[PDB]
A paper describes a structure:
Dihydroflavonol 4-reductase (DFR) and flavanone 4-reductase (FNR) reduce dihydroflavonols and flavanones, respectively, using NAD(P)H to produce flavan-(3)-4-(di)ols in flavonoid biosynthesis. Anthocyanidin reductase (ANR) reduces anthocyanidins to flavan-3-ols. In addition to their sequences, the 3D structures of recombinant DFR, FNR and ANR from sorghum and switchgrass showed a high level of similarity. The catalytic mechanism, substrate-specificity and key residues of three reductases were deduced from crystal structures, site-directed mutagenesis, molecular docking, kinetics, and thermodynamic ana-lyses.
Numbering used by the authors:
A (entry chain B), B (entry chain A): 11 to 344
The structure:
Amino acid sequence: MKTACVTGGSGYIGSALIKLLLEKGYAVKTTVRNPDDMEKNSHLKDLQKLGPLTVFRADMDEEGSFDDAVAGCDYVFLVAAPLHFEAQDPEKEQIEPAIQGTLNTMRSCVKAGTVRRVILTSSVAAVYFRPDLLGDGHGHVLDEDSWSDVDFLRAHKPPTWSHCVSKVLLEKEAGRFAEEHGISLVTILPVIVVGAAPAPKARSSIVDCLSMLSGDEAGLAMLRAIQKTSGEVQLVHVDDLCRAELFLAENATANGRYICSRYHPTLVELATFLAQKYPQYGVKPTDFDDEERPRVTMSLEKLIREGFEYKHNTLEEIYDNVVEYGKALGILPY
Amino acid sequence: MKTACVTGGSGYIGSALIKLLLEKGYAVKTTVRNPDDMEKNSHLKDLQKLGPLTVFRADMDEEGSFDDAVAGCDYVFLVAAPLHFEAQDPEKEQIEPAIQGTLNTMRSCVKAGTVRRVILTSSVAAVYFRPDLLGDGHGHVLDEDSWSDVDFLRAHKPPTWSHCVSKVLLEKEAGRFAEEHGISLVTILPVIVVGAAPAPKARSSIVDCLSMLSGDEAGLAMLRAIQKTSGEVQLVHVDDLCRAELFLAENATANGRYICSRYHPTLVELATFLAQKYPQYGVKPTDFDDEERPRVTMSLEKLIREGFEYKHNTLEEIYDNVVEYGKALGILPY
Ligand SMILES: O=C1C[C@@H](c2ccc(O)cc2)Oc2cc(O)cc(O)c21
Ligand SMILES: O=C1C[C@@H](c2ccc(O)cc2)Oc2cc(O)cc(O)c21
């Protein structure tokens, strides 16, 4: 029986990974910042009903705190924490702590001497910010060779520049570190993630995809900004993301970084689908009518080439269970 | 040096296949119904400059005429192109000749004794007609397991029913014949094909993708019909189709049938692109506004996970050279 560690077990993606690992016969260790907070971590008790699940305390700013959690693990899933709130000095407050915290966990992985592979969950924040491709007014198909432009982001500091710079640098630093220390590191890069997970206090990762239904002003702004940039948005079901992370840990030939994406609708298509299937929220699809814009899209083909198969392939399947989750979280009123 | 036969050398797809094969170092044999008609075959003289190209007279409707062209070949590219003349009895004027013409050439392949693989060019006409799915209000991703409903098509005879039936039945029959004689048959299923080819008298294969520029009422009706059915159209560059045919010929593990597609725009996306890239034609994108419909799309992934790579990936790249071809053919008035 193989053993896996999932960092950030209180979070959206972390909780979904733990569920899949248990269902697949793994013994799981997970880290949280306060194991006694059973309002935040009640799902970890439920999940113990599926297989061996051990909870540990750990924090990214606390050097070595991940030692006991990763020890004995065949695979380690590093789920990066979402930034959450802005900062006066993003370099000192966000970017640098993101690098350091990632290395901190890397070190606990070498020290375990048992980790066959580390799967880093990042996002396409590290892929898409290309001043040439986004700005030249032509369509483009990006892939895993594309990296967000750190120099341009620091020069002009557009909104979310710090989320993108921190993802790029922490991935590069973790790769540099995995090189010098002989540990296999594979990175996955999700688009907007959709679907239910066990975590009771998730939100950040769910606001964008439900914002047409909720009216969340920040969410809608984000979807519109992505569409203004790229001509569309990109979505993937959380269960396919989780299956992809498992796939990448278990298949020895997997190497480097992988975009994880399945459906790329315009907002009017998405709004139209949501209005038809969930009319109780009064979505007006004409609120998202827009000129057709050049499409700048992230290719999904690398994961496909390696033999992975997505299970949520239509728009409706990608949204198959997220609405009931938004209800339970209070993101939606009913 | 391997040798290959390409049927329908005066045709759009046949001529582009010959070009690719010569460039890639094959000796090539091709068939045309009248090797003298230089209206139709002037390109063959030109193509002979690229490598060893030999021309034969043959006719689908004439048993054995393909024997000479196919002899000695390692690969045969069965480009089933010419259909019929919609008469009172499509089952005897179109469907049956299509089947028998295909089996005619397959027999030459058996007689040759040398043929390691036959690549049949069909179309997603043999894939998409799924009345159990086209009106159910949901999206669907169809793949190579989906076949057009021949029974339903014969029962209700919607427009172009016999076209779809011809394609389904000749593919079924050719595969049955191939299995009986232990010959390798692989079928490729293009969507709408875009791009220049050597053939100086092609037309029907290019009218549709040029129809918003030419205003061809038949082409435009076809496009609107596809979009009312599937909520989008699907396009592929002729050069990727030819490279995919060669890929399927050369890759031993290739097996069965393969959708070939790369871009799936709405008509309003396509018209916006064309209007901006080619304003001299007067396209009005609002002529193609339409409500969003559930998407019924053909999966591209079988070819992808077998190792093939498309080179024309954006909408602009798929349209990189067809307008000049259209001007040359007279499809476009200027
Ligand atoms: O920087 C990114 C990545 C980007 C993205 C997603 C999908 C897509 O198709 C293109 C870009 O989305 C985001 C969404 C957020 O709430 C915050 C972010 O920082 C970002
Ligand atoms: O539905 C069809 C049928 C096919 C076709 C063309 C001509 C004809 O006479 C019959 C069928 O062309 C297509 C091309 C597409 O990208 C998507 C489609 O859905 C289709």
